[PDB]
Symmetry: D2
Subunit: 310 residues, 4 copies
């Protein structure tokens, strides 16, 4: 029975973690969130300890550890800028970390975490559910059979209501900006499929749209990211869809929205089986996303312009 | 299409109000919550406006009024002490109010609300789902047949985890205390069935237990309230059950937990149909609960002592 | 005895408002702040009500109004995005408003307040302390005696520590951005002295520097604003100074640091006498600051580039 | 040059700590507060780091420690329940702690901190400025010359406006209650003069008044504590005084309000000189204050009743 603590319990994504912990036969020992709108927790783990103050949470988990009943994992569902320091808290307390994406905001934070693993005997893992999406695992096998770099069009639209622009998600110091907070999913998919980015361009940047181009070891990629649902293709909009997440490559197209929200238990299962996504796996997309925070806009060549900018 | 604005969107009970507004064919025009952990809202009303600052939400709703697009109803799912001033906001904005229980904390607030309903021509309503619970409607009908007052044992145990003690729920200025925040359900049930309280006693009053006695026009009632699930009767507790909500009238048992969390849409419907629970309906249980904040403890006679007290 | 309520009581700036209210013979009936380090209030108005919830503060003031004991002014010292909706509250409660700068963030908000003033017969005022100052007030009479366009270089560097970057003051939706949160003082001084901005350019807009160029009816202005103290001129910086606040008009300087934390009381007095700074006085700087946060960057000509760039 | 970090920078007492660090020739390296009303700091330590997130503050200080540049002291001016876990943070960072009163809330926390001191070779100190108040030091000397149990009337009135009741200071879980948050000063003065409390009674306990009776090894003590300035004696009220802090014993009375707010630098100097008030010194008043939280009210005998209750 794997022992978990959880940060960010009051949040949107937290119930998916509570479900994962239940489904892998784990127990939630304690949670942290400065907000107390967490009453849903009793329907999953009615005996879990709860803290509003991170310093009190830390002291409690240390007391559990300084006596043999420590947690095995800290699940981290706090705002992005808190992932790094809460992962360090976990490792120091003798727990593995399982952090939401992006694992951290900066490449310097990845480098420091690699050193800290070696001094604490624990490991840092991250939630990248696209890496367990059955359609994308199948695409990955297909693409591996083919020599040469591929040409890819990546379109990632996921609608967000008006609350998003009043939240931490649009504070770049907290979220990393749109290309990190939302785009890390696809920058990570592209690194997993096609390796390291040799060249990066950004062609459009507004509060709701970013678009650009990547030259990766295995592919040339035109990409478009939005949180404005008007960019969902019209035939799908008609049927009420608010998302469109598509990779077109090698003469095929895979739209990977189905089950996007139903893969957190599989990520937990892979992680507890020792097949999790660690620092080495997460680092490349974080490097790309971080470069994009400060990269100047450029004018795309026609070959490099995503079609939604045409 | 009834037009609603909602306060308390990030909270535990908010999704039941989103489901109710949906199911009655209403539209959520705008919501208010100082917390922004509200991403669930896009799965219901992906175009609703959102505010963290009450002053800005008010100015926005005042602008809508002034241009003939005012909201019809403010639904209120904020902490209890904010119900009164949020209902004052609804009324001044030219909207009706539908507030979670307890409707307000104090009888003086009920009295001032009556004045403001007269000044504004608007109405104040509240969510008391026990009044639409089919077993309790059935009970009320059977009691109408009967002559004389009844002897009643009311036992109300609903377990709460460790987060509750770190929330506004235990700040008596915010919540009104245990007998208000949780007990209002049953004080209101008893007022609805049995009328006004002629005499009130409190026999036990700790952070997790209140017990006492009421003499009502239609009943003598021994009551016990707890948020410690250890008080669930042993034959249910041994199975892991954490709630027990029972009214026993002249020795006949009605346990009413089933469907307790599945009646908000029916309250909303009754309200919109002119059958809502207004100030006059809610006032008596508020008067009882408010008395209980300062009523001195007394030693029960054996005939007035709830069985759980020994 | 003029009755006041105050918003933003916990904030850096509220003590000058407590002094003005005291000094002008007013009484503070109630205050609002989400935060609770407001104890200083006890040494001025030891009986004032206090609220952390805006809706409870509004209901309390509305009760007072309805029984004929309403406040006469709402003084507003909250973060900038709250000024507009708190002035709206003041007018709905039948009070005048006296707001910190910037009075509101957007010209559309000014227009709405003008409608609402007419509806309620109450007035919106703002604290423009540079306008009652001795050394800036000196200019306006002189300058005004001469004709011809002036050539102005405006430089303001006011160092801010690491806390600033973690506060609402860098959230553009809350503060209006650097030029507004720092700038607005001086854009208002410039509009006061030299009229409407007929051309506006922004040359730099980074998190610690905003710089640009204005042409006003009465002057051209090269301006530079920063909260990075490394831009304090070296003869001051070498001494450890972290601020520098200069307007040079046709080669003639005035530096501005001295009477800066100073003149809230006179502004209260003028306002109470019917000589306050209203929407019409405030609007132009608000229009310019709204452009300064929204216009695209452009590359300056040599002639139009502030020397510090 | 003694290196400090500070918690609670945006609050009421912090400016006194900034002044103290400056006056003892220290440097403030970094500060933590979730609130950002802190601009004052620039007039003292213009280059200090600042954090809103405790986990980021702790990671920053951990980095300093690891590269041989750790702070020497953590000064703690956060809410009272945070003192214990922030002192734990200091000790694990290899810093001494200098915490505002009360040092911690509970005797069990004192006991844990004694164990952690021994582990780390760092020390915990606290601000008890009455122990450096010249009038009280002079009184202590005068009393010493005697022998036999003293008879004491302690009256401690310190006015607070309406903001206090909407702050953390009235949340007993955060502040310890009135007898702890305000009262610790005088319980500590009494323990310093007269030793262990062998008998404790509480006679009144309202939001603005606590009163009771103690018998200590060296004195019997009738005490009264209020934040209602109406209890300042009329003659002092008539001249506008809002405090009255009086100890009457041995045929004299010492009123110790003068300079009560001007002794923080002296506490810092004593602490840096190795003459600070440690766990052993602070423990007894913490034990007494904690007992008073749960002690039921009793009816006083006339002899044991503070005069202000008569
Ligand atoms: N597909 C996915 O894998 C997916 C989807 C959504 C969000 N996320 C990620 O999950 C995280 C949570 O996002 P969300 O949408 O639930 O955001 P949210 O704003 O709904 O919830 C964030 C929670 O963090 C809490 N918080 C703030 N500071 C904290 C601290 N010091 N400790 C603990 N909790 C703290 C907030 O009070 C809040 O309840 C982010 O890292 C986000 O990128 C991932
Ligand atoms: N069976 C029932 O009918 C039932 C069950 C649970 C709760 N309730 C009631 O619903 C209300 C909410 O309880 P909850 O359990 O959801 O609590 P909660 O603590 O989960 O959520 C409360 C929400 O109110 C928000 N809030 C705080 N101040 C606000 C303001 N000024 N405006 C708008 N929002 C504000 C908080 O940020 C939070 O998201 C309470 O009145 C409670 O009694 C009813
Ligand atoms: N020289 C000047 O005249 C001068 C100097 C500084 C600031 N200001 C202005 O004064 C105002 C205060 O800035 P500050 O420096 O005190 O920042 P601040 O962050 O120190 O003060 C913040 C106070 O406002 C509060 N607040 C947030 N929401 C509120 C609400 N809905 N109602 C009332 N209060 C609320 C916050 O809790 C905070 O405690 C701003 O408009 C700023 O532009 C003017
Ligand atoms: N005479 C004295 O020695 C004296 C006088 C006043 C207060 N105090 C003590 O000083 C402490 C502060 O009291 P105050 O009056 O300044 O209260 P306050 O409410 O004015 O200030 C409290 C500060 O703590 C901050 N805070 C909350 N959580 C924090 C955290 N995790 N880390 C750091 N900061 C955090 C708050 O945001 C706030 O700015 C308390 O322990 C109090 O008992 C002592
Ligand atoms: O909806 C998406 O594609 C992104 C989900 C996510 O990771 C987020 O919202 O943070
Ligand atoms: O569970 C219950 O019976 C009470 C639900 C409720 O109203 C509450 O938690 O506020
Ligand atoms: O320091 C300055 O010059 C600007 C003051 C100001 O208005 C602010 O800080 O918001
Ligand atoms: O004023 C006093 O005597 C006590 C000071 C205070 O508030 C405190 O110590 O928290
Ligand atoms: Cl906690
Ligand atoms: Cl808002
Ligand atoms: Cl309030
Ligand atoms: Cl931080």
């Amino acid at each position: 029975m794997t022992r978990f603590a959880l940060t960010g319990l009051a949040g949107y994504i937290a119930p998916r973690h509570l479900k994962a912990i239940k489904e892998v036969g784990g127990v939630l020992v304690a949670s942290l969130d400065p907000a107390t709108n967490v009453g849903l927790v009793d329907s999953f783990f009615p005996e879990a300890e709860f803290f509003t103050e991170p310093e009190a949470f830390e002291a409690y988990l240390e007391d559990l550890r300084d006596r043999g009943e420590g947690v095995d994992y800290l699940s981290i569902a706090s705002p992005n800028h808190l992932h790094y320091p809460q992962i360090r808290m976990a490792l120091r307390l003798g727990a593995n970390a399982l952090s939401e994406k992006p694992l951290v905001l900066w490449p310097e934070e990845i480098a420091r975490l690699k050193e800290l693993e070696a001094r604490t005997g624990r490991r840092v893992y991250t939630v990248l559910q696209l890496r367990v999406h059955p359609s994308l695992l199948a695409l990955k096998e297909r693409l591996g059979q083919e020599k040469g770099a591929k040409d890819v069009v990546l379109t990632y639209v996921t609608g967000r209501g008006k609350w998003y622009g009043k939240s931490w998600k649009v504070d770049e110091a907290k979220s990393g900006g749109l290309a990190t907070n939302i785009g890390i999913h696809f920058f990570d998919l592209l690194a997993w499929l096609f390796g390291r980015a040799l060249h990066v361009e950004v062609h459009a940047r507004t509060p709701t749209v970013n678009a650009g181009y990547l030259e990766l070891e295995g592919a040339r990629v035109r990409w478009f990211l939005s949180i404005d649902p008007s960019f969902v293709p019209e035939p799908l909009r008609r049927q009420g869809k608010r998302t469109y997440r598509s990779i077109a490559v090698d003469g095929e197209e895979v739209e990977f929205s189905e089950g996007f929200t139903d893969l957190h238990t599989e990520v937990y299962r892979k992680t507890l089986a020792g097949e999790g996504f660690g620092l080495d796996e997460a680092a490349e997309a974080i490097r790309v996303a971080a470069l994009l925070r400060t990269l100047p806009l450029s004018q795309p060549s026609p070959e490099n312009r995503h079609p939604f900018l045409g």
